[PDB]
Amino acid sequence: DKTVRWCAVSEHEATKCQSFRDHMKSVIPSDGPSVACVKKASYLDCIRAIAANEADAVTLDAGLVYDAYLAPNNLKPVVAEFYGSKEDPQTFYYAVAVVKKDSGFQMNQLRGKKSCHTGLGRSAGWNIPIGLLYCDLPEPRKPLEKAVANFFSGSCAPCADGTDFPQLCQLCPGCGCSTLNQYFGYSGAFKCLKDGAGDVAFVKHSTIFENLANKADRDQYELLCLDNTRKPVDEYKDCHLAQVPSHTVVARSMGGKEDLIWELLNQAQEHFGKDKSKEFQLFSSPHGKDLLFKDSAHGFLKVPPRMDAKMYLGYEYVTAIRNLREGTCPCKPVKWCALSHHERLKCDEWSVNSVGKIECVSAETTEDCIAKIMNGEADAMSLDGGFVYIAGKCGLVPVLAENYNAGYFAVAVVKKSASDLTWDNLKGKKSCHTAVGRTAGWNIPMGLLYNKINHCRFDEFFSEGCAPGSKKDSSLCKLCMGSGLNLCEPNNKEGYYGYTGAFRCLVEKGDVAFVKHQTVPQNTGGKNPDPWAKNLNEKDYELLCLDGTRKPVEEYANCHLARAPNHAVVTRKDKEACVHKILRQQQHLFGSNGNFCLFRSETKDLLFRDDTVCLAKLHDRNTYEKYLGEEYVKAVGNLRKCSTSSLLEACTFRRP
Ligand SMILES: [Fe+3]
Ligand SMILES: [Fe+3]
């Protein structure tokens, strides 16, 4: 059967669900999803029923989304409620810490300040801020109210026990738990700040815009960022305490039925959603308010399938709720993320030589390791500039850059015998790329090509080619040499993948290869002993300049497509300082100094490139926008209209 068993937590919800089930069977045909309704006593009972394969779906708050993720439940977000409008769908809200401009303190200086909270037990006003500040609170940290009462000098914490902790009600005596208290709720907490009662108000990002119409008044307020800096109130997406999803449908991570749940809800909103004017309304009911879904909801959005709960909730939110539930308080070792057996063996050797300073975790793909750095399972890894873009769009920052001597040169190599090829038109020619999304093989060459054809459908511009990472049926996979599953894969099991692989593709099948300036010299003249490269002479290959002219391989300095940003190490902002220090201390111990160490591989370019001489600092360029540059980001923004990165789709869902 294609039945979705929806879980209700009340008798009113079960009645609406039964009405939901009956009306669906009128609009959905024979081969479509049907609804069944399981009634449980609580949200947690619904979570257990779904984990026990007794139900399939339920819509939860963010805190319960975290509960549904923990073992042995292992549920994941599948469908999202959005609000506001269908043209500007609102799925998340941001918990922010608002202060007055020029008040002179940062997030790590809140001790002794006066605080304004929407109310004890609320998300943006209490659970999230106190969660992030948990180990800053004095010991003993339980009961939590007493620890907060000895952190802030005075507060307005509505509904707190002012009898035992009167400091929590200094700004609103009695801590009135109703709108009779002027500083209660979403608006009252900000009024507590606006009226000068407190120094910081923990509210939602939208609270400031609902209480201050003129931007001139909003310019008198700032937000506290977790990096201990301040930003204007309209930059909350780059300066919040946590990004929080409002209402989320969850399901089993394995066993589904995700596709069925979305097909059901998508057809449900098409027939009974907002402004559908039927007898049955998906987002209201005569039996009660907010049954199954919020009455204020406007519809549903499908959660990208790469998304898990920790990625959906976000690193900041998970940190805050973990502290509140576990109560665990300790520069710590840096956890490197390896992508292969030989990369893991190298890191494992690096870790013991570190005597603890470095540790290793492994993942199967580059995107998987990036996700581990995002949620905290891993700490750092080095990436091509194309992945720095993805890592940046997902919230990570670069901390150090690989230096080989301004970065390396992206070149277009062609066979010199074919003296007809020029950069001014390679249409209908066979191309070989390192991989889709990489700097030298894709972002730089195809970025310029986009400016002349105005579309990212490069498989109908070139006749065929090998671009690892393309859809298996693409014409840009026809030239690749991988066998079976490995064909066109962006990894080692595809022989045409990478700098060297793309040059081999040119030598054997292609017409033009997009690689870096040293690729041809180090793979010709016997330097590469493999049969495909052993007898190659580098004077038999040329580069395509932007002029439309061609020059020898060694003349790349005056015949390159563009300068490429160096490979860089990425990490979370909360570990930027510790990674910057430990790595620069380890390269002084194992850098350019069996014979070598860190910058040498048993195979080829493990963890770092082998031509790396140092790990250089970045100064202000600690941001993917400022590291890659405006032109690089603009080009990738043009190319993403044909992107197939599931990790980038998940992060773009949280921050378009
Ligand atoms: Fe609130
Ligand atoms: Fe690269």
Question: What does DSSP assign to residue 540?
Answer: G
Q: How far is the CA of 297 from the centre of ligand 1 (A)?
A: 17
Q: How far is the CA of 448 from the centre of ligand 1 (A)?
A: 47
Q: In angstroms, what is the resolution?
A: 2.5
Ligand with an atom nearest the CA of residue 205: 1
Cβ count within 10 A of residue 355: 8
Q: How far is the CA of 564 from the centre of ligand 2 (A)?
A: 8
Q: How far is the CA of 57 from the centre of ligand 1 (A)?
A: 26
Residue 123 phi/psi, 5-degree rounding, is: -70, -70
Ligand with an atom nearest the CA of residue 628: 2
- Rounded to whole angstroms, the Cα distance separating 439 from 388 reads 10
Ligand with an atom nearest the CA of residue 119: 1
Q: Are 97 and 231 in contact (CB under 8 A)?
A: no
Q: How far is the CA of 438 from the centre of ligand 2 (A)?
A: 6
Q: Annotated binding site for hydrogencarbonate: which residue ranges?
A: 118, 122, 124-125, 434, 438, 440-441
Ligand with an atom nearest the CA of residue 127: 1
- Residue 237's nearest CA partner among 191, 215, 206, 200 is 206
- Rounded to whole angstroms, the Cα distance separating 30 from 14 reads 24
The CA–CA distances, whole Å, from 188 to 175, 192, 203, 647 equal 12, 6, 10, 39
- Longest Cα–Cα distance of the chain, Å, equals 90
Coarse DSSP helix, strand, coil percentages of the chain, rounded to the nearest 5 percent: 35, 20, 45
What approach was used to elucidate this structure? X-ray
Question: Pairing between strand 75-84 and 92-100?
Answer: unpaired
Q: Are 55 and 49 in contact (CB under 8 A)?
A: yes
Q: Find the domain containing 535 and state its range.
A: 409-563
Q: Are 255 and 53 in contact (CB under 8 A)?
A: yes
User: Residue 187 contacts by C-beta under 8 Å, 6 or more apart in sequence?
Assistant: 207, 210, 211
The tokens for 574 are: 């909360």
Q: Looking at the DSSP assignment, which residues form a beta bridge with residue 465?
A: 431
Ligand with an atom nearest the CA of residue 565: 2
- Rounded to whole angstroms, the Cα distance separating 110 from 63 reads 25
Residue 577 phi/psi, 5-degree rounding, is: -65, -45
- Rounded to whole angstroms, the Cα distance separating 52 from 46 reads 10
Alpha carbon 462 to chain centroid, angstroms: 32
- Rounded to whole angstroms, the Cα distance separating 120 from 129 reads 11
The tokens for 184 are: 């209660």
Ligand with an atom nearest the CA of residue 384: 2
CATH of the domain at 99: 3.40.190.10
Burial of 129 (0-12, 13-18, 19+ CB in 10 A): buried
The tokens for 605 are: 């370019």
Cβ count within 10 A of residue 142: 10
- Rounded to whole angstroms, the Cα distance separating 16 from 5 reads 14
Per the document, the length of the chain is: 656
Q: Annotated binding site: which residue ranges?
A: 61, 93, 118, 122, 124-125, 186, 247, 384, 408, 434, 438, 440-441, 499, 567
Q: Are 47 and 56 in contact (CB under 8 A)?
A: no
Q: Looking at the DSSP assignment, which residues form a beta bridge with residue 8?
A: 39
- Residue 48's nearest CA partner among 248, 245, 247, 250 is 250
Ligand 2 is an ion; residues with CB less than 5 A from it = 384, 439
Sole residue written with tokens 């995700």:
258
Alpha carbon 488 to chain centroid, angstroms: 25
Residue 135 phi/psi, 5-degree rounding, is: -80, -10
Q: How far is the CA of 124 from the centre of ligand 1 (A)?
A: 5
Q: How far is the CA of 427 from the centre of ligand 2 (A)?
A: 25
Q: Annotated binding site for Fe(3+): which residue ranges?
A: 61, 93, 186, 247, 384, 408, 499, 567
Cβ count within 10 A of residue 291: 22
Alpha carbon 310 to chain centroid, angstroms: 10
- Rounded to whole angstroms, the Cα distance separating 614 from 354 reads 18
Q: Are 564 and 411 in contact (CB under 8 A)?
A: no
Ligand with an atom nearest the CA of residue 444: 2
Q: How far is the CA of 284 from the centre of ligand 1 (A)?
A: 23
- Residue 65's nearest CA partner among 53, 52, 82, 78 is 78
- Rounded to whole angstroms, the Cα distance separating 130 from 136 reads 9
Q: How far is the CA of 98 from the centre of ligand 2 (A)?
A: 41
Q: How far is the CA of 453 from the centre of ligand 1 (A)?
A: 49
Ligand with an atom nearest the CA of residue 386: 2
